[PDB]
Amino acid sequence: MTDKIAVLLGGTSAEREVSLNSGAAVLAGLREGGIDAYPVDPKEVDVTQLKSMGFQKVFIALHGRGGEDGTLQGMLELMGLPYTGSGVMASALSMDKLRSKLLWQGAGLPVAPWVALTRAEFEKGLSDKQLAEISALGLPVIVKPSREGSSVGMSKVVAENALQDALRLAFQHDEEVLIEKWLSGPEFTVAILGEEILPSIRIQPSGTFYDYEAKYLSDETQYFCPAGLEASQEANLQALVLKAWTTLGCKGWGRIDVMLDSDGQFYLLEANTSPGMTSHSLVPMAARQAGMSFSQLVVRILELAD
Amino acid sequence: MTDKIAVLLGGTSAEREVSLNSGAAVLAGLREGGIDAYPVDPKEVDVTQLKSMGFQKVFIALHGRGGEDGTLQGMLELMGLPYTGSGVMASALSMDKLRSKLLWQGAGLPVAPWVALTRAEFEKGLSDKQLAEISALGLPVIVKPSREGSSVGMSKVVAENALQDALRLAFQHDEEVLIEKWLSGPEFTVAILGEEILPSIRIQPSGTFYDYEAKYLSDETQYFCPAGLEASQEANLQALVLKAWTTLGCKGWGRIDVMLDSDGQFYLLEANTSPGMTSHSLVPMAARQAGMSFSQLVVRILELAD
Ligand SMILES: Nc1ncnc2c1ncn2[C@@H]1O[C@H](COP(=O)(O)OP(=O)(O)O)[C@@H](O)[C@H]1O
Ligand SMILES: Nc1ncnc2c1ncn2[C@@H]1O[C@H](COP(=O)(O)OP(=O)(O)O)[C@@H](O)[C@H]1O
Ligand SMILES: [Mg+2]
Ligand SMILES: [Mg+2]
Ligand SMILES: [Mg+2]
Ligand SMILES: [Mg+2]
Ligand SMILES: [Mg+2]
Ligand SMILES: [Mg+2]
Numbered sequence: 001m002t003d004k005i006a007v008l009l010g011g012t013s014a015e016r017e018v019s020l021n022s023g024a025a026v027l028a029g030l031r032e033g034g035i036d037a038y039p040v041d042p043k044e045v046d047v048t049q050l051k052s053m054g055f056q057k058v059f060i061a062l063h064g065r066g067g068e069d070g071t072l073q074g075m076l077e078l079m080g081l082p083y084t085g086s087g088v089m090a091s092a093l094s095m096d097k098l099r100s101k102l103l104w105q106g107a108g109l110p111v112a113p114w115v116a117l118t119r120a121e122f123e124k125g126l127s128d129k130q131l132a133e134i135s136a137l138g139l140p141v142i143v144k145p146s147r148e149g150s151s152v153g154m155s156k157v158v159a160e161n162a163l164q165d166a167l168r169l170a171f172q173h174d175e176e177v178l179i180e181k182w183l184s185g186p187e188f189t190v191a192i193l194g195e196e197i198l199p200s201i202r203i204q205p206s207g208t209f210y211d212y213e214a215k216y217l218s219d220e221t222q223y224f225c226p227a228g229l230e231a232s233q234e235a236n237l238q239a240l241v242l243k244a245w246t247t248l249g250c251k252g253w254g255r256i257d258v259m260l261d262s263d264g265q266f267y268l269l270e271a272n273t274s275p276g277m278t279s280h281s282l283v284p285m286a287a288r289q290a291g292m293s294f295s296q297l298v299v300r301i302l303e304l305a306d
Numbered sequence: 307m308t309d310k311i312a313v314l315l316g317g318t319s320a321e322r323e324v325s326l327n328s329g330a331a332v333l334a335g336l337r338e339g340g341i342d343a344y345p346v347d348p349k350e351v352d353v354t355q356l357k358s359m360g361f362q363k364v365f366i367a368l369h370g371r372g373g374e375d376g377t378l379q380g381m382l383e384l385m386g387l388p389y390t391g392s393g394v395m396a397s398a399l400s401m402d403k404l405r406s407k408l409l410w411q412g413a414g415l416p417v418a419p420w421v422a423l424t425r426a427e428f429e430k431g432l433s434d435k436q437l438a439e440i441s442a443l444g445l446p447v448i449v450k451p452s453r454e455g456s457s458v459g460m461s462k463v464v465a466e467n468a469l470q471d472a473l474r475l476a477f478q479h480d481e482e483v484l485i486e487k488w489l490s491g492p493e494f495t496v497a498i499l500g501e502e503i504l505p506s507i508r509i510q511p512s513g514t515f516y517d518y519e520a521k522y523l524s525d526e527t528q529y530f531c532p533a534g535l536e537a538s539q540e541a542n543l544q545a546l547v548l549k550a551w552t553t554l555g556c557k558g559w560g561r562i563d564v565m566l567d568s569d570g571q572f573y574l575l576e577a578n579t580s581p582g583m584t585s586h587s588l589v590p591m592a593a594r595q596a597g598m599s600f601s602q603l604v605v606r607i608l609e610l611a612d
Contacts, residue, residue: 047384048354048384048385069394069395070376070380070394070395070398071379071380071383071384071394072380072384073377073380074376074377074378074379074380074381074383074384074394075380075381075383075384075385077377077380077381078353078354078377078378078380078381079354079381088375088376088377088380088394088398089375089376089398089399089401089402089405092376092394092395092398092399093395093398093399093405095395096395096555099395099399099409099554099555101412102408102409102412102413102553103405103408103409103412104412105411105412106407106408106409106410106411106412106413107408107412247408249402249405
């Protein structure tokens with residue numbers, strides 16, 4: 001018998017439905033590439049039993065905490081099963097937007113001005129210093145949970161008195177949140193596959209930002225790949241993303257989200273270490289422009305595992 | 307029936323002998339406190355089996371990667387067992403001196419000037435540019451692996467032409483290495499227990515730095531607790547350590563190592579999320595001076611767990 005591969009999909013995060021779609025596509029893609037792969041949903045199957053179940057290797061198609069944040073990676077390390085994507089530290093770090101931003105700023109990489117808040121800071125009342133820092137960002141701002149994906153818990157604030165509503169929403173999803181300066185765009189994303197940086201994609205939502213609807217349900221979002229940048233700027237963007245990726249310590253494959261601001265500079269938003277892999281997701285779109293079918297892409301991601 | 311507690315000790319790192327000593331102390335302290343505790347060494351016992359063995363909670367007294375770096379924490383999270391100390395992300399970051407330094411720099415906290423190198427860079431041979439950056443640090447410098455403890459793999463470089471030998475050593479111990487400005491001292495450490503910062507300790511080794519012998523095997527090291535700082539200065543140190551702790555996201559307990567430099571300012575060296583607990587160890591000294599028995603200290607660390 002050749003290796004048996006578990007495609008972990010679904011799980012229990014806010015991104016469960018996205019992950020069910022990613023894993024459905026990855027399962028078929030791997031089987032098309034001759035890989036003996038099976039779907040396993042950790043919501044229904046105890047993943048501590050994977051080795052007992054006869055699996056040799058794991059393709060992680062989970063998104064969000066519990067699959068993307070180092071916890072599952074640590075279990076798999078101790079179980080001794082090779083797995084796709086980044087290891088424990090870089091997965092945990094990339095899930096935490098607050099600490100990714102601090103790390104990048106420490107490395108001299110460009111990030112949007114921001115204020116971080118804990119639940120205790122917000123619900124016990126903002127200090128004068130915090131209020132001053134928030135005021136200095138101007139409006140609009142965007143508010144995000146630190147540890148979500150798929151634009152869950154995120155919103156744009158257009159009036160001072162409505163910041164509290166954005167903060168209450170974000171605190172429904174995490175214990176720590178970010179208030180960030182609004183960036184003008186345009187918006188890009190850059191996939192990484194092994195040592196290869198894939199062609200950037202320019203993303204144009206029809207509404208206010210690339211929210212859950214714009215990501216998964218709209219026929220109106222526009223995508224440009226190639227992204228239409230002057231060659232030197234595409235190269236700059238690729239080099240920025242490579243430095244962001246290596247600073248975090250990520251490996252295997254992933255996708256970094258980036259926006260221009262009205263000063264003409266790129267700013268890093270976040271890194272994703274288990275990116276969406278629905279048929280129509282962004283990593284497959286960039287890989288298609290670099291000559292890879294979806295099956296070729298997933299077989300390559302798997303080949304990179306330990 | 308009362309909880310059955312596993313004290314994890316020993317393991318397979320360079321710090322194994324220290325950990326066997328830490329775990330022996332912790333075990334006696336817990337039992338002295340009425341806790342039903344038992345030692346388990348992961349080198350001898352398959353730790354993925356703890357819950358199957360009837361354990362309810364885990365006291366981590368391991369030191370170094372694979373006990374301290376988030377991997378074990380992730381496994382315990384998926385097994386559903388509460389455990390002492392920091393979670394996955396903060397454990398992983400605290401083991402990674404390079405990324406701790408970047409995060410702290412991003413947060414505006416004081417860190418010694420440094421250069422980082424990867425193994426691939428070292429194997430290729432160093433560029434004129436990298437040598438230029440290293441040269442800017444001045445001399446002396448210390449060379450350390452990023453992810454070790456107990457002063458393993460470290461050397462003091464007092465001549466420019468001695469750097470290569472120091473790197474050849476540190477690369478035996480990690481794939482990422484730091485070259486840091488040599489700090490004048492004096493040297494301090496600060497224990498954290500729950501929400502409490504304990505009074506600091508001034509550490510005076512007899513040799514060139516606080517090396518493995520000075521830490522565990524010498525009767526010549528001196529320790530001062532209280533540290534002899536002016537009241538405002540002790541308060542400054544505690545505040546710095548609290549910020550450094552909260553920036554990494556650490557919880558439960560730990561210990562942060564700090565040095566003065568010749569500008570009279572404090573600089574953060576590193577955080578340790580499973581600190582030593584031996585008769586030579588620093589957390590027990592801070593707890594003793596703060597009016598706790600060692601048994602009360604370990605019962606408290608356990609009570610703080612999840
Ligand atoms: N500072 C910002 N200004 C404007 N739009 C932003 C900003 N940060 C994020 N966005 C928008 O919100 C989307 C989701 O933000 P991101 O930081 O990538 O979190 P997620 O993990 O949920 O994708 C982005 O794709 C972009 O459309
Ligand atoms: N930049 C430096 N200058 C002078 N001494 C240092 C410096 N960095 C570390 N040391 C010495 O080396 C010891 C161990 O370094 P540390 O960074 O705490 O790593 P470890 O995890 O091995 O303890 C310190 O306790 C201190 O005596
Ligand atoms: Mg994301
Ligand atoms: Mg995103
Ligand atoms: Mg240490
Ligand atoms: Mg020589
Ligand atoms: Mg002794
Ligand atoms: Mg130390």
